[PDB]
């Protein structure tokens, strides 16, 4: 894969050149947030048992065709599948935020699942809808703007990592169209 440091290698390899003084204001820029980049990667893997449980339950309680009899989450096999089947996507962005780039997010999971969810049944309505409930809750934890649990951190701005992180989340979120 490529991290945020290996992004500036390969296009500067493509220019047949050196890592010069042009990208020094980007490879000092990721040096500075690495206190709060590592503070933000802890905030998703801490709550991720509550996060994927909230993501399926909010999807089901507003779309009751998933608890249709003979449906996609009707049996206990098909309900325990989707608790894992949307959790690995939550796991794969937890490595992608830490690397500072979503280069891992294409060659590990996004190469295939657009034509694989329909290949055994899983439709396009609720799998796009399962990402967006995780998306507005992932921005709440890193900004300490949840409703029920307030994490004790330092003081500072977090919109810069929110426009980062959303990218990973949503990129897999779409994908499926």
């Amino acid at each position: 894969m490529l991290d945020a440091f290996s992004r500036v290698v390969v296009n500067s390899d493509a220019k047949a050149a050196y890592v010069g003084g042009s990208d020094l204001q980007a490879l000092k820029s990721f040096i500075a947030d690495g206190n709060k980049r590592l503070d933000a990667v802890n905030s998703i893997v801490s709550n991720a048992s509550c996060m994927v449980s909230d993501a399926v339950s909010g999807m089901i309680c507003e779309n009751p065709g998933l608890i249709s009899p003979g449906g996609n989450c009707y049996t206990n096999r098909r309900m325990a599948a989707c608790l894992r089947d949307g959790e690995i996507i939550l796991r794969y962005v937890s490595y992608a935020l830490l690397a500072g780039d979503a280069s891992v997010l294409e060659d590990r999971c996004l190469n295939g699942l657009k034509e694989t969810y329909i290949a055994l049944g899983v439709p396009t309505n609720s799998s796009i809808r399962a990402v967006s409930i995780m998306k507005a809750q992932a921005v709440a934890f890193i900004t300490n703007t949840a409703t029920e649990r307030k994490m004790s951190f330092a003081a500072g701005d977090c919109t810069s990592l929110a426009s980062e992180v959303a990218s990973y989340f949503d990129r897999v979120g779409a994908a499926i169209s």
Partner: protein
């Protein structure tokens, strides 16, 4: 031990000496910032401008009317069509192109102010624009609290076409100029708060404008006592018109210090422009 279907929620028991058990509870702890949604083509993170940031259209609006506020107030200085002698901006030798580089340094050093003093001067000038206008409007402060250059060109502009500034009101005796000197020392102490000299009384960049700034004021110090006999007599009544009413309210001692010593109460400069 054993339950019943009866209703005794109400009721108590009285044997509540109850200072023997103390209890509490909690809940809280949840801030919230409004964040945007949809990855395709977008993601925004908060940024530090350290300025007004109230619109690009508002920012280019803001310097135009305060230029017009200054040109309003250049037209009260030249009400009668004189470039009046209180405004001096040079020396004997020409050097106002050298004092251009003094004032464009002040145009530059006020631009490269740090984030504390860029933001402190936005709010102290807003309440000083309330002090600058006498009347209380629906209009004037409703420019002067959104816009700050307009507030800054009003506390400079309206106050320079009265004669309560520095170096313009002449003291009578040795006693008035000495406490005129001593209140300037605390205005040094304001702009030099500690062992570091500030960036903002720098008054020069090159060797030519180093000693040009010294001989500029000594010609302007003479042009206080040169120009008139009644406008400088109107200065000593004007010096109470900035200090008594919006600088030392409540202190009678600091009120009769103005009416006994107007020229000492005229370089008190409480418009904190870091000079």
């Amino acid at each position: 031990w054993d339950k019943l279907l009866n209703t005794k929620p109400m009721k108590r028991q009285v044997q509540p000496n109850p200072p023997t058990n103390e209890t509490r509870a909690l809940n809280l702890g949840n801030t919230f910032r409004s964040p945007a949604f949809k990855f395709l083509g977008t993601l925004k993170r908060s940024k530090d401008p350290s300025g007004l940031r109230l619109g690009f259209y508002g920012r280019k609006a803001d310097d135009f009317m305060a230029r017009s506020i200054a040109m309003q107030a250049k037209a009260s200085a030249a009400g009668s069509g004189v470039y009046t002698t209180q405004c001096s901006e040079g020396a004997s030798k020409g050097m106002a192109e050298n004092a251009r580089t003094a004032s464009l340094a002040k145009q530059f050093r006020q631009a490269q102010r740090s984030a504390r003093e860029m933001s402190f001067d936005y709010y102290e000038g807003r309440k000083y624009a309330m002090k600058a206008v006498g009347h209380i409007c629906n209009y004037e402060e409703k420019i002067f609290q959104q816009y700050n250059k307009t507030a800054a060109a009003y506390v400079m502009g309206k106050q320079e076409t009265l004669l309560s500034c520095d170096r313009y009101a002449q003291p009578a005796n040795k006693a008035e100029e000495y406490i005129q000197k001593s209140v300037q020392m605390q205005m040094k102490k304001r702009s030099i708060p500690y062992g570091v000299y500030t960036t903002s009384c720098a008054d020069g960049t090159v060797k030519g404008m180093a000693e040009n700034a010294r001989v500029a004021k000594e010609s302007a110090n003479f042009r206080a006592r040169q120009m008139s006999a009644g406008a400088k007599a109107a200065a000593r009544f004007n010096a109470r018109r900035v200090a008594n009413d919006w600088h030392n309210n409540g202190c009678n001692y600091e009120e009769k210090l103005t009416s006994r010593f107007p020229a000492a109460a005229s370089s008190v400069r409480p418009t904190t422009n870091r000079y």
